[PDB]
Design a binder for this molecule. Sequence first.
Ligand code: MG
Ligand code: MG
Ligand code: MG
Ligand code: MG
Ligand code: MG
Ligand code: MG
Ligand code: MG
Ligand code: MG
Ligand code: MG
Ligand code: MG
Ligand code: MG
Ligand code: MG
Ligand code: MG
Ligand code: MG
Ligand code: MG
Lengths: 68, 118, 252, 234
Amino acid sequence: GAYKYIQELWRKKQSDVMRFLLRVRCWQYRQLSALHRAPRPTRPDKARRLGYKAKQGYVIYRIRVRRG
Amino acid sequence: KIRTSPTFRRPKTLRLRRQPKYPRKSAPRRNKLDHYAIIKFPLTTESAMKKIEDNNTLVFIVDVKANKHQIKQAVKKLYDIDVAKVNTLIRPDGEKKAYVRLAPDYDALDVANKIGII
Amino acid sequence: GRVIRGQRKGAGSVFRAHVKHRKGAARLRAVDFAERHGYIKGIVKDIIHDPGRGAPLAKVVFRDPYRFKKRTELFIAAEGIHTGQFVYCGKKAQLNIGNVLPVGTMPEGTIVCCLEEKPGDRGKLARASGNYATVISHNPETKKTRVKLPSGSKKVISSANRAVVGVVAGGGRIDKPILKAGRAYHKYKAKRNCWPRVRGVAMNPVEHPFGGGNHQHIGKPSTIRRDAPAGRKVGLIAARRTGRLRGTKTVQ
Amino acid sequence: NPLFEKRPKNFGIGQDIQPKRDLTRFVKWPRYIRLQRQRAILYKRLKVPPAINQFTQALDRQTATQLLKLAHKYRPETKQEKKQRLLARAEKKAAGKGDVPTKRPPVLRAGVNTVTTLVENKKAQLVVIAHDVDPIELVVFLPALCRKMGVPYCIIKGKARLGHLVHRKTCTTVAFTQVNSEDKGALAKLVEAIRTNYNDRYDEIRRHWGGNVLGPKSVARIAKLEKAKAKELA
RNA sequence: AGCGCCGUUCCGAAGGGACGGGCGAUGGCCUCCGUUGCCCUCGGCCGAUCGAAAGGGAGUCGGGUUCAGAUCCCCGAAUC
RNA sequence: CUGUUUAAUUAAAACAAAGCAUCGCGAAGGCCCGCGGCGGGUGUUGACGCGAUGUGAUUUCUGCCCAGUGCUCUGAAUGU
RNA sequence: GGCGAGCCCGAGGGGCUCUCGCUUCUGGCGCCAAGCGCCCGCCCGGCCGGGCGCGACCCGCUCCGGGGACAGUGCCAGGU
Ligand SMILES: [Mg+2]
Ligand SMILES: [Mg+2]
Ligand SMILES: [Mg+2]
Ligand SMILES: [Mg+2]
Ligand SMILES: [Mg+2]
Ligand SMILES: [Mg+2]
Ligand SMILES: [Mg+2]
Ligand SMILES: [Mg+2]
Ligand SMILES: [Mg+2]
Ligand SMILES: [Mg+2]
Ligand SMILES: [Mg+2]
Ligand SMILES: [Mg+2]
Ligand SMILES: [Mg+2]
Ligand SMILES: [Mg+2]
Ligand SMILES: [Mg+2]
């Protein structure tokens, strides 16, 4: 289907089309709290290949840590 | 829609009243501090009998959890006599002693003769 | 091996400022439309003495241009103002003693005080008793203004920040000798616990780099560089030249 | 009538207090408002890649409504009538004893995976895409795939509007595969205008770079400077 | 890393209450009022809370009473 | 000078003191606290202020040495 | 918008270019709108009780300013 496309697109995360998205999302997450609830996963294919299923009972949290 | 003030506040939203589908406790507990549990036994000391005839007041050793209103209600329910006032004090041993003054129409001598103490 | 007195100052345990009887922070009024497109008039109720400070604090009541309420502010009372004198605050205010107005409008050589480093800093520079700053230059394009501060330094600042006109009241405050230790104690008791000031050569080497020895001497060059660690900077700190001065220093 | 006089209040600097104004431009919005607002300004300031500029450029209010009226005839079958037809099927099968009494009804296919598996096998007559998706990466690859496969693809405004026909809150893409004989002409009349708008201009869309637009407060000052410079040159 | 810590107004959608008006429902002798649900208008906390038996803090005095109580008990006279 | 000092071997010539000098800092700063944050003290502070030293009522005097050890300043002419 | 000031062309006027609105003798007061133009239900073409707009102009993509691809942050290296 399309998850293979999304995976092969996210693999090359240094191109411009992906770098712009990553920078915008990093800026957006910098303004939020250190720990919060994302209502839907930003990476659906990566969540599926980890064990996330689109049904009730599965929650996604976004959390930042200090680099270093 | 005009914003009269530059301060944004939380909009007053509707709050549902708590409507429990089932009670958390099946039956309400029985009031253990009943009229018979409020007072325990009167005092028969000489200082207590001195207040019987000279003051028209009785002395009762009651629970520490009982206040003046509960003492008055318990006395009225048990002996069917009127109460003027109640003076309570915590004895140095931990109990509570209450001097309950009867109304002028009642006499403490007959109440004492009716309930044990003479 | 022990923390020195100058190093224990930053802990803030007992060296905090005695801010109990302080009346209030000396700050100007907030910049708004009524200040950048005109002026407003206020009435000085009274001047009061702020403990731990030589400059008196004047209470000024203004009328709120948006709400029906009187706003009370505490300004630094410039020398030459009395209770009841109307004080004007704004851009096109008349140039008089007590009135505050942006530095970009006053002419050169104007003696002002209680100004701001940046537009909106609310009166930070030249706040001590008897000090003033001198406007010496102006720039219409790329708005800048050169001012000479009481330290002789010529600093370039913005042309939008404000400054009250006049010298701070209480000048010559240092012409009187303390004349005894009691008055110095009563003075510093309102400021902070920093008066006793025991010399470093009197104590032991444990509490100061200068203490010790059978003779009360220093033994080391008191001139210490800027790269010295904490607890080491004692005596003269990066003294480019020491000894009794000969004329004017003339250092930027 | 005898004494009905006017009280003109002076709302200047220090005559009277200011009345209540809109103040919507200066109100302190919450953090979730301030975050979701300046995101559009950031998207307009930054030089967006040419793979996002495909979106935010969709059909007008006429052709989009026409495509919606066309899709309203091939909507996915709801669960109520689905249960109805499944109950009627087992009855009419025992009644008539027929193999296939109901012809397969032509219906549009929903879902990005289904749309992709259809366009890869060249089974879709048309593709319509939404642009209100939050992760753009789930959609950036589709226009190039449709350009490579030669099928007509069109972008439209409103994933909820795309969604309502499919009876769901959010739907990304919809593929038209089978069309009735009497709607085939109406569909072919619009696939041409879609091809001349998206397919034939794919190179220009891929070479076009959007965004990079400064704010009006920064454009007014450069306009003042260029005016003052032109008045000095000539 | 963490038991947690710094921070107390800072980077917070941090006022759940009321004056009045309107709609709707209910109860008391439905004459008249008391409430409940909703709408409109208005309303800076100087941010929860703790922190003094010598600080601020309304209002009891006289006489008598016991082996041990007194501005507390009794009488009499007041007050918040 | 008044004052303080080693409770339990020292009350002093010791410490402190006003006074006299010198140094750093115009706040994206000076001197410090802190494992951590643009966290805290000075700071409800702004050079008549803050921070760090020496000497030690008043008067008069403050001599000569930058070689060495320290402090500071300069030019990508110039070595490592 | 001229209740205003203009450098100009010009017979009435025009805007190439512009200052911009109305608080400075006085220890007083100043808010929750007057008026105008419309829209409803009630007194036969009336009174009373209400609603909207102008008063108080329009449009917009950062609350307003000051720095800024620096300062600061993480890692590594060399001095002290
Ligand atoms: Mg869910
Ligand atoms: Mg000393
Ligand atoms: Mg010693
Ligand atoms: Mg040492
Ligand atoms: Mg020697
Ligand atoms: Mg308390
Ligand atoms: Mg008595
Ligand atoms: Mg006694
Ligand atoms: Mg001592
Ligand atoms: Mg001794
Ligand atoms: Mg600091
Ligand atoms: Mg001397
Ligand atoms: Mg000498
Ligand atoms: Mg030399
Ligand atoms: Mg800005």
